């Protein structure tokens, strides 16, 4: 997996570029992420975490290896209800969070290969998202914790 870091870090709260076309490189993170944000304990995983200042965050929120997802630039477009989730992403420490998410949200994206879609997702993942980028901002969810 990836060398990535815990709280508080600068990779972590510091800032990615947006890009605008991808290739076979980020398909490259992106499952670097998956490799790694599984081995871990998170559904969703940024690519600030390991040690990067790019837009790339995958989410994990089935059984079985069989809801793969990716996000290359999530640009946010829709964002319905105001839901939180009781759950702890991996870079954190010791406490879990309730954190103060959204509920659903609509986003346009690039993927692995750099093919842009425009995905909606709800409750959850809608959450695992919103926080990734949180963190591919600047702010850790160390901020409604703290
Ligand atoms: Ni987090």
Redesign the pocket.
């Given at each position: 997996v990836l060398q990535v870091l815990h709280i508080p870090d600068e990779r972590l709260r510091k800032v990615a570029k947006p890009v605008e076309e991808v290739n076979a490189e980020i398909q490259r993170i992106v499952d670097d992420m998956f490799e790694t944000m599984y081995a871990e304990e998170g559904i969703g995983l940024a690519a600030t975490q390991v040690d990067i200042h790019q837009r790339i965050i995958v989410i994990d929120v089935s059984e079985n290896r069989d809801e793969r997802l990716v996000l290359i630039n999530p640009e946010l477009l829709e964002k319905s209800g105001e839901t939180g989730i009781e759950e702890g992403?991996?870079?954190?420490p010791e406490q879990r969070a309730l954190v103060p998410r959204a509920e659903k949200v609509k986003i346009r994206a690039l993927d692995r290969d750099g093919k842009p879609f425009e995905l909606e997702a709800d409750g959850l993942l809608a959450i695992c998202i919103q926080?990734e980028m949180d963190?591919l901002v600047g702010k850790?969810?160390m901020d409604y914790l703290s």
């Open positions: 992403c991996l870079s954190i926080h963190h850790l969810f």
